[PDB]
Design a protein around this ligand. Structure first.
Ligand SMILES: Cc1ccccc1OCC(=O)Nc1cccnc1
Ligand SMILES: *[C@@H]1O[C@H](CO)[C@@H](O)[C@H](O)[C@H]1NC(C)=O
Length: 353
């Protein structure tokens, strides 16, 4: 199991001011480190954050966290469950900031909640250097759903932090799972007046101001003041990134469909769904490290059965291993770019049931 450590710097906090933290299982023979960001939506104003505190409190506070957690999927230490990185040092960072890992604002006389996601990642990295990370050769920052978007927003900052601290030999890389969203037209639509009616772009623009949210520097410089919300969308931020990033994305992601107001399918909805798959596939055509099956699902990398899905005969653990080999051009029988071309959910027989 992975063991809980609360941060020694207790000024870096979850939403309610309790200390943030991480779960760790060391592997002393290994110089590989996997730091995984949890997901779980977000909140963007006082009223909706208050509701989240009543019934989603573990995503806002460490008060009730358990002392241990079992590693699953890519966080498993058994080769049977994790063919890719079973011998690595494993870290699970709980999401308790409700800010897509972007925030840098403390609780104060002016702020009911703290939004410190960007500062939590930096503080975890700092405290791990004293526990073995100083001797690493590869640090893979991974994450699912809001945590996948968090990888995109934070991977280059982790790289800059380690360089400035004097560790230029640690190779920082990202693995973004189910965090690559489209700011597309919705299937049915409403003007932004509450949580359920506010479209992704309008909700993120309000959140960024509420959280004091920060985005990667090169993307910020392209879009400029007031337009930083654009950098939460993978196809817009990815081209600006310098660290290698592997992108895992279902073509018909369930969270994407929910934000699009989609739930015996007639012509209009058939065309909408087929167009969404085509648009997603278009955005990945120049992403050389990617895995994108034609399934209706959400998240995969910490699921126990993540080994089952294949694209063109290649599983996800195999694709990631091929990525590792490519970063030692293309490799015989060891592909890294795997995107389905069939146009309807479950046209791939390996999709999750
Ligand atoms: C849509 C989006 C774009 C960029 C960055 C983050 C985003 O949203 C993450 C998320 O988790 N959304 C969600 C909405 C309702 C129910 N579940 C999930
Ligand atoms: C605690 O965290 C803040 C914010 O990341 C940092 O600037 C500060 O120096 C830390 N405190 C100590 C004693 O390192």
């Amino acid at each position: 199991d992975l063991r809980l450590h609360l941060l020694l710097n207790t000024s870096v906090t979850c939403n309610d001011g309790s200390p943030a933290g991480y779960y760790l299982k060391e592997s002393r023979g290994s110089r590989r480190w996997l730091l995984f960001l949890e997901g779980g939506w977000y909140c963007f104003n006082r009223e909706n954050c208050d509701s989240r505190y009543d019934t989603m409190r573990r995503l806002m506070s460490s008060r009730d966290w358990p002392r241990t957690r079992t590693g699953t999927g890519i966080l498993s230490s058994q080769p049977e469950e994790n063919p890719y990185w079973w011998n690595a040092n494993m870290v699970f960072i709980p999401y308790c900031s409700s800010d897509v890992w972007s925030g840098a604002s403390s609780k104060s006389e002016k702020n009911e909640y703290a939004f410190m996601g960007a500062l939590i990642i930096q503080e975890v990295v700092r405290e791990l250097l004293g526990r073995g990370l100083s001797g690493a050769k590869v640090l893979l920052l991974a994450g699912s759903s809001a945590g996948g978007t968090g990888v995109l927003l934070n991977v280059d900052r982790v790289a800059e932090q380690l360089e400035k601290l004097g560790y230029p030999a640690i190779q920082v890389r990202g693995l973004a799972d189910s965090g690559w969203f489209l700011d597309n037209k919705q299937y049915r639509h409403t003007d932004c007046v509450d949580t359920i009616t506010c479209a992704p772009t309008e909700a993120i623009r309000r959140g960024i101001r509420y959280w004091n949210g920060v985005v990667p520097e090169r993307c910020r410089r392209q879009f400029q003041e007031g337009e930083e919300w654009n950098c939460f969308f993978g196809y817009k931020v990815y081209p600006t990134l310098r660290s290698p990033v592997f992108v895992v994305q279902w073509l018909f992601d369930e969270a994407q469909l929910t934000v699009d107001n989609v739930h015996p399918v007639q012509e209009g909805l058939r065309l909408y769904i087929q167009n969404l798959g085509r648009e997603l596939r278009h955005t990945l055509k120049d992403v050389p490290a990617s895995f994108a099956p034609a399934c209706l699902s959400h998240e995969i990398i910490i699921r126990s059965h993540w080994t089952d899905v294949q694209v063109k005969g290649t599983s996800l653990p195999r694709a990631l291993h091929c990525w590792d080999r490519s970063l030692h051009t293309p490799l015989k029988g060891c592909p890294v770019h795997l995107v389905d071309s069939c146009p309807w959910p479950h046209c791939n027989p390996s999709c999750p049931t």
